[PDB]
Amino acid sequence: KPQPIAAANWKCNGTTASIEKLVQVFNEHTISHDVQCVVAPTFVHIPLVQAKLRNPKYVISAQNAIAKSGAFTGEVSMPILKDIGVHWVILGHSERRTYYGETDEIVAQKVSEACKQGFMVIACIGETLQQREANQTAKVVLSQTSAIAAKLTKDAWNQVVLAYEPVWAIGTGKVATPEQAQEVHLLLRKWVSENIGTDVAAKLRILYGGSVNAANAATLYAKPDINGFLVGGASLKPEFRDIIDATR
């Protein structure tokens, strides 16, 4: 397997005091294996986390961005993030697709621009409960992935991490079973192998997210095509340490 990733999506949460305490916990956890840890604070907390986070296995990610600076009140651009030292971004999270109008073509454009600007990108894909029950999971996730792929060159895939998060698993407590997740990860990896390249597919990290916790992480990671996790609720807690260690 390629190098795993354990990514903490703090979403729209945190106070300075709670973040200081949690970062201390993460700093004091010695990670002995090869894993890339990622923490994605809210924009306003990025400087605090940059100042306090010292664990060498971690990088900081933004939770969203727009491609260019300019007259976009309220938004944060990729050049602005790069200038402050952030070169990872999560794009296309279900919450943004649902609440904030991010269509496949908007996500694909953002991913393309992030790659051109040198970011590592965690690009999120996943089906809704209605799509799953209609036996459309594969069609949906492959459509979302091919929309992204259409805007990328083969070289750019070195910067891409895919995160499969069934929408019905996000925040609900209803994690996908290892078999459910593995079926989708395998389908995605096969599509990448056939449509992009077998060398790309072998090195591509495909993360699972949606109700990962420290108790279910190891049995997800045991599956051959799962390369780590994008973690929401449990990444606000000290048991994120055990999620990291489940990628051994």
- What kind of experiment solved this structure? X-ray
Rounded CA separation 128/165 (Å): 9
Please, what is the end-to-end C-alpha distance for the chain in angstroms?
A: 11
Q: Binding site: which residues? A: 9, 11
Q: Does residue 165 have an active-site annotation?
A: yes
Q: If we measure between CA atoms, which residue out of 106, 107, 116, 202 comes closest to residue 159?
A: 116
Q: Which residues pair with 162 in a beta bridge?
A: 123, 206
What are the backbone angles phi and psi of residue 246, rounded to the nearest 5°? Answer: -75, -5
User: 88 near 120, Cβ under 8 Å?
Assistant: yes
Our count of domains for the chain comes to 1
Residue 109 structural domain: 1-248
DSSP string of 160-213, one letter each residue? EEEEE--GGGSSSS-PPPHHHHHHHHHHHHHHHHHHT-HHHHHH--EEEESS--
Which amino acid would we find at residue 132?
R
Q: Which of 45, 93, 102, 127 is catalytic?
A: 93
Rounded CA separation 208/169 (Å): 10
Q: Measured on CA atoms in the order 108, 104, 125, 23, is the torsion positive or negative? A: positive
Rounded CA separation 172/184 (Å): 19
CA distances (Å), 74 to each of 45, 66, 103, 122, in order? 16, 10, 20, 22
Q: Does residue 194 have an active-site annotation?
A: no
Rounded CA separation 122/221 (Å): 18
Q: Binding site for substrate: which residues? A: 9, 11
| Alpha helices, DSSP H, located in the chain | 16-28, 46-52, 78-84, 94-99, 104-116, 129-133, 137-149, 178-195, 198-203, 217-221, 240-245
